[PDB]
Amino acid sequence: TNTKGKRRGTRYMFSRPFRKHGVVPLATYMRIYKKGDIVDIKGMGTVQKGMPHKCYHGKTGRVYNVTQHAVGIVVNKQVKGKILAKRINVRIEHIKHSKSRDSFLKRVKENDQKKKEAKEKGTWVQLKRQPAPPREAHFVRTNGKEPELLEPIPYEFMA
Amino acid sequence: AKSKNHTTHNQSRKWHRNGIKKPRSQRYESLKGVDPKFLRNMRFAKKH
Amino acid sequence: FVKVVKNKAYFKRYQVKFRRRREGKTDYYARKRLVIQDKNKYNTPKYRMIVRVTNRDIICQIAYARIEGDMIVCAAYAHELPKYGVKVGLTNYAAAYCTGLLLARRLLNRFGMDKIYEGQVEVTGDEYNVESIDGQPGAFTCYLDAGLARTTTGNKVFGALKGAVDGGLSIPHSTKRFPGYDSESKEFNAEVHRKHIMGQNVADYMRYLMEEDEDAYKKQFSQYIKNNVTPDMMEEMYKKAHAAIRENPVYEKKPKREVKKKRWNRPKMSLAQKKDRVAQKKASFLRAQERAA
Amino acid sequence: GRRPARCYRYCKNKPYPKSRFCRGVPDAKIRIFDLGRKKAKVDEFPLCGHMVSDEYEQLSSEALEAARICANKYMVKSCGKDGFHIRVRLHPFHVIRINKMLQTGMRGAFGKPQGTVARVHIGQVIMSIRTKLQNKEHVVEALRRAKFKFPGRQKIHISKKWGFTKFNADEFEDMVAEKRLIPDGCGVKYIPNRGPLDKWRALHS
Amino acid sequence: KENPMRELRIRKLCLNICVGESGDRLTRAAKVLEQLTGQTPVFSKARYTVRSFGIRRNEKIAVHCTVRGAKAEEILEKGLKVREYELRKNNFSDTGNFGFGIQEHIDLGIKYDPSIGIYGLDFYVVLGRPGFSIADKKRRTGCIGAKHRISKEEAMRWFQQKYDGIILPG
RNA sequence: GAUUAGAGGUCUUGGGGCCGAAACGAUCUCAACCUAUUCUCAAACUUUAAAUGGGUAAGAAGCCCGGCUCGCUGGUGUGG
RNA sequence: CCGUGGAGCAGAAGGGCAAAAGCUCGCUUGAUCUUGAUUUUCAGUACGAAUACAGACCGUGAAAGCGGGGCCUCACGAUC
RNA sequence: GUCUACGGCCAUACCACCCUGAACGCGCCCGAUCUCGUCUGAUCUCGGAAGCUAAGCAGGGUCGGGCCUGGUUAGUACUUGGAUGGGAGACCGCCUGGGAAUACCGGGUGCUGUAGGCUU
Ligand SMILES: [Mg+2]
Ligand SMILES: [Mg+2]
Ligand SMILES: [Mg+2]
Ligand SMILES: [Mg+2]
Ligand SMILES: [Mg+2]
Ligand SMILES: [Mg+2]
Ligand SMILES: [Mg+2]
Ligand SMILES: [Mg+2]
Ligand SMILES: [Mg+2]
Ligand SMILES: [Mg+2]
Ligand SMILES: [Mg+2]
Ligand SMILES: [Mg+2]
Ligand SMILES: [Mg+2]
Ligand SMILES: [Mg+2]
């Protein structure tokens, strides 16, 4: 059977990208994580302290505790037929703010603003994101040039 | 007397016929596992 | 022969270091431990004091890091000393002390905290640390950024640190790198540190030159003679400089003069130019070779 | 001495090359991969003919050598001793294994190395012949009689390229005259308009 | 014309003696070297272990020292006087430095002491130029450009012009 | 990490010879070497790199205000 | 002089590392005392191993800091 | 137009050679009494200001290498789902969707934050 080591099969997952080894850029250290941010997990092999287990690599969780160097986050893990929301502590290098939430936040601010506006105007405005509707009817103008014929080319071997 | 060693052939069906329920998310989550000194502060603030 | 080391594969696989590391200006290993604030302090600034001794100047700044680039809140330059009285000798230990004190006083004066935390008005050169006064705003705290300088005993970065500490800033330190610490006895000589601060170590050098040689003395201190500074008066002029700094530490920017918009360096030539150049180079070579043949 | 070739015709296992893990591999029988007047320039052997595989399979190294020997024999018989240049374009890198029986049975049934084969894809060249223009039917017949030494199905194709190059013969001469490719050994060097002007001066001088 | 201070100056002179075995011979070689150079030299341990030369790992087998300035040109003058200001084309390196060896030491102005014995040594000189400290200073290190470096021909010209020596072919 | 083939350079060395007392002085060469090319490969190689797929979000437990508590952090009723 | 690591980091291999995690010196014993939480196999039980803290005593450094064993992945043991 | 101190992103910024740098600045540079450290004041530390853009550094150049970004390769390779499709097989064609990577050919060659100067 296999081995139950903590880092089995991570030679590519925890490795560094090509031509990106060396000193960790300081912007990663200079970011602020508060209680309740949605955050992504991406193990970085450069630092070995507080490295998350390989099964949380690429997972997104919620911050619930902030500490000197690390952050505690609640993340869902599918174990057999059930999902457990378990909390793990990850050092700040292996973490990154999720941009999936800021889009929704900006949308909230923007449609709240356009709801506050036009409230006095009384006009109607659409807020829900409708799915891509079918294309409407239109005209395709030929400019006096007729469409050119397309025919299959004859078979002839290359190799 | 050999025998089959390991399989997961029916496991997905077994899990799904009752459904993989997400954890019961709900407001006011517990405060266990939080930094002790920050917790001590929050207790003092609530007290006063 | 021999392999070519700087091979195309070598350049393909080569990974450059950071720009500051390539220029040699920044020690990122030290910067990581120096400018990084604890995560549970959130956006609480972590101030630090940058001291850089140049070939002709002393730079002292107060900075805290930000993602787009660390921001300078206060700065003080050694070449401002002639305004307060120090006309010459802008690099020595005394000048470092005055510029550190000026930076400290400028920060507090910008910052509305002069009447509190006056610090050592009378220079003693001994172990001094400021304590926060209850019912009043807390003392400013920062940490020294020695940079790439070798932190041996008697370094001018530590001189600037002492100057600001006497100014009133609360900077953790120990009296081990100040001039005066004696390794063997492991003791500190506050009087020796004081005379180094006030510049006597140059006064005895000039008197030593007086003892034997004159032309060598002129060669060593030419601008000193031009500015008419004598060994005895250096202590008095440094005291006057300290008094003036503590009196008026505010900085006024020099008025801006309108530019005449003159380009001093060659602009980048365009694709059309650099293509016409090679075209006419080929034409010229062909026309020269057809005759030379 | 060796097992029939039908026992190793299909690409059933992953490529299993000889390396620090697979040790003790016997040497492949084919050692020479080209012969004839290989020390010839590019402008005297314009005609090029390939034998192209039509099946995805694996060809034994020895069968490679046997086909090479047959083609070389017919060529020296027909177009003289040095009027051609052969090139086998398949190197046997995938070693095969054998679990010999002498009674353990199927226990511990991982085979020892036996021989080497080359895995061939659909439409991949097997052998290439370059020669003068007039020996076209000679090339075709040599490749046709070499076909009988291989399993599966193969085709003969007279390439439109010039010799063993990647340039079409109907403007190869024009391009070399214009000095866009410079002949060397048995091939050519492409000269793009990208180097320093010193090389351009050197080859236009 | 010329730049007044792109001129050639010697920046260090290295003396060494490799005896190949530790002991009384080694310390007496150190003594003669320090008497010659006016300063204490240092011992270099063997990098590896080879029994052909009868040496092992980490024992002192050579004594070397370096000098700059006044004493450097005095010692170099003594050495060239011993070598009658005669050098060969191959004595000069591609980087502009050069050097030679003296088979025995008492000729260049050292009194013969029978106890210490006799020792030869190697002289090497590293030709410099104002600004070469950029390559090795700490704060902002950098190269020394292409024009500013020294070549074999410049070293030859400097040697033959400043010390009016002769470069015999070889 | 395997791997075929020819090109151009030199003394950087070796091998057959040759004129040479000898001479990188010289003649061919075979080589190893270097520089551009060229044929064919990798489950325990890789600059690149899919399709299928694995998380997270798509609001009332949300946003926007005003004010209190804190023994924590604090240049600063600062930050949290 | 060139030298992006082609070396070394105890050991297998893989990952990681250049004013360092490598080499050489200086000083030391955070390999120390103590309650909890969490991860890894998992039944989501132990052992083992590991991760963030917190409370004392310290070490080191000018200091920021770093350190409660070994750069990480293994080197170990219930009841009576 | 540009520099210095501290930086962010870390080659569009690197590497090789060549040309030009007004002012400030950064440097090279001159010495070792004191502080400090070496075999050596070479490095480090300290005290200065005779000379110089030679070098570093900055700007520019190269039908430059590299790097970055496009086109081609290519709807090719591969691939989700489907068939009582073909074929002795090996494999291949079609339907429904997604869709690469070399060679080869183009373009570009650092942006920018805070504080402080010079261009009076
Ligand atoms: Mg059975
Ligand atoms: Mg069973
Ligand atoms: Mg340091
Ligand atoms: Mg049979
Ligand atoms: Mg199989
Ligand atoms: Mg270190
Ligand atoms: Mg503790
Ligand atoms: Mg260690
Ligand atoms: Mg000096
Ligand atoms: Mg310059
Ligand atoms: Mg110049
Ligand atoms: Mg280019
Ligand atoms: Mg700027
Ligand atoms: Mg004017």
From Swiss-Prot, chain A:
Record gene name:
RPL21
Keywords in alphabetical order, please: Cytoplasm, Endoplasmic reticulum, Ribonucleoprotein, Ribosomal protein
A Pfam cross-reference name: Ribosomal_L21e
Give start-end positions of Basic and acidic residues composition bias.
111-122, 135-144
Range of residues in the leader sequence: none
GO molecular function ontology, one term from the record:
structural constituent of ribosome
Give the family this protein belongs to, as stated in its UniProt record: Belongs to the eukaryotic ribosomal protein eL21 family.
Biological role:
Component of the large ribosomal subunit. The ribosome is a large ribonucleoprotein complex responsible for the synthesis of proteins in the cell.
Q: What is its main location?
A: cytoplasm
Q: Which Gene Ontology cellular-component terms appear in the entry?
A: cytosol; endoplasmic reticulum; ribonucleoprotein complex; ribosome
Quaternary form?
A: Component of the large ribosomal subunit.
Q: What is this protein called?
A: Large ribosomal subunit protein eL21
Region entry Disordered: which residue ranges?
111-144
Stored Gene3D superfamilies:
6.10.250.3260, Ribosomal protein L21 (2.30.30.70)
Q: Which GO terms describe its biological process?
A: translation
The record's subcellular location field reads:
Cytoplasm, Cytosol; Cytoplasm; Endoplasmic reticulum
UniProtKB/Swiss-Prot annotation, chain B:
Q: Which residues carry this modification: N6-acetyllysine?
A: K32
**Ranges where the record places region Disordered:** 1-32
Question: Ranges of Basic residues compositional bias?
Answer: 1-25
Where does the record place the modification N6-methyllysine?
K4
Q: Which residues are modified to Phosphoserine?
A: S30
Q: Tell me the leader sequence span.
A: none
Compartments, record wording: Cytoplasm
Q: Which domain of life is it from?
A: Eukaryota
Family in the record: Belongs to the eukaryotic ribosomal protein eL29 family.
Tell me the function of this protein.
Answer: Component of the large ribosomal subunit. The ribosome is a large ribonucleoprotein complex responsible for the synthesis of proteins in the cell.
Question: How is the subunit organization of this protein annotated in UniProt?
Answer: Component of the large ribosomal subunit.
Q: What is this protein called?
A: Large ribosomal subunit protein eL29
Species of origin reads: Oryctolagus cuniculus
Q: Which gene encodes it?
A: RPL29
Q: Which residues of the full protein are shown?
A: 2 to 49 of 245
UniProtKB/Swiss-Prot annotation, chain D:
**Cited InterPro entries:** Ribosomal_uL16, Ribosomal_uL16_CS_euk_arc, Ribosomal_uL16_dom, Ribosomal_uL16_euk_arch, Ribosomal_uL16_sf
Localization: Cytoplasm
Q: Where is this cross-link: Glycyl lysine isopeptide (Lys-Gly) (interchain with G-Cter in ubiquitin)?
A: K179
Crosslink site: Glycyl lysine isopeptide (Lys-Gly) (interchain with G-Cter in SUMO2)? K166
Q: Identify residues that carry Citrulline.
A: R31
Pfam families in UniProt:
Ribosomal_L16
Q: How is it modified after translation?
A: Citrullinated by PADI4.
Q: Name one GO biological process term.
A: translation
Instruction: For this UniProt record, give its keywords in alphabetical order, as a comma-separated list.
Output: Citrullination, Cytoplasm, Developmental protein, Isopeptide bond, Ribonucleoprotein, Ribosomal protein, Ubl conjugation
Q: Which GO terms of the cellular component aspect does the record hold?
A: cytosolic large ribosomal subunit
Q: Which GO terms describe its molecular function?
A: structural constituent of ribosome
**Domain of life assignment:** Eukaryota
Assembly with partners or alone? Component of the large ribosomal subunit. Mature ribosomes consist of a small (40S) and a large (60S) subunit. The 40S subunit contains about 33 different proteins and 1 molecule of RNA (18S). The 60S subunit contains about 49 different proteins and 3 molecules of RNA (28S, 5.8S and 5S).
Family matches, as PANTHER family: 60S RIBOSOMAL PROTEIN L10
The record describes the protein's role as:
Component of the large ribosomal subunit. Plays a role in the formation of actively translating ribosomes. May play a role in the embryonic brain development.
Q: Which family does it belong to?
A: Belongs to the universal ribosomal protein uL16 family.
Q: What is this protein called?
A: Large ribosomal subunit protein uL16
Gene that specifies this protein: RPL10
Swiss-Prot record, chain E:
The entry's protein name is: Large ribosomal subunit protein uL5
Q: How does it assemble?
A: Component of the large ribosomal subunit (LSU). Part of the 5S RNP complex, which is a LSU subcomplex composed of the 5S RNA, RPL5 and RPL11. Component of a hexameric 5S RNP precursor complex, composed of 5S RNA, RRS1, RPF2/BXDC1, RPL5, RPL11 and HEATR3; this complex acts as a precursor for ribosome assembly. Interacts with PML. Interacts with MDM2 (via its RanBP2-type zinc finger domain); negatively regulates MDM2-mediated TP53 ubiquitination and degradation. Interacts with NOP53; retains RPL11 into the nucleolus.
Q: Which Pfam families match?
A: Ribosomal_L5 (PF00281), Ribosomal_L5_C (PF00673)
What role does it play? Answer: Component of the ribosome, a large ribonucleoprotein complex responsible for the synthesis of proteins in the cell. The small ribosomal subunit (SSU) binds messenger RNAs (mRNAs) and translates the encoded message by selecting cognate aminoacyl-transfer RNA (tRNA) molecules. The large subunit (LSU) contains the ribosomal catalytic site termed the peptidyl transferase center (PTC), which catalyzes the formation of peptide bonds, thereby polymerizing the amino acids delivered by tRNAs into a polypeptide chain.
The similarity annotation says: Belongs to the universal ribosomal protein uL5 family.
Q: What is its main location?
A: nucleus
Using the UniProt entry, state the residues involved in the cross-link Glycyl lysine isopeptide (Lys-Gly) (interchain with G-Cter in SUMO2), renumbered to this chain. K31, K45, K147
> Which PROSITE patterns does the record cross-reference, listed alphabetically?
RIBOSOMAL_L5
Q: Name one GO cellular component term.
A: ribosome
GN (gene name): RPL11
Per the record, residues carrying Phosphothreonine are T37, T40
- In this UniProt entry, the residues modified to N6-acetyllysine are K45, K78
Classify the source by domain of life.
Eukaryota
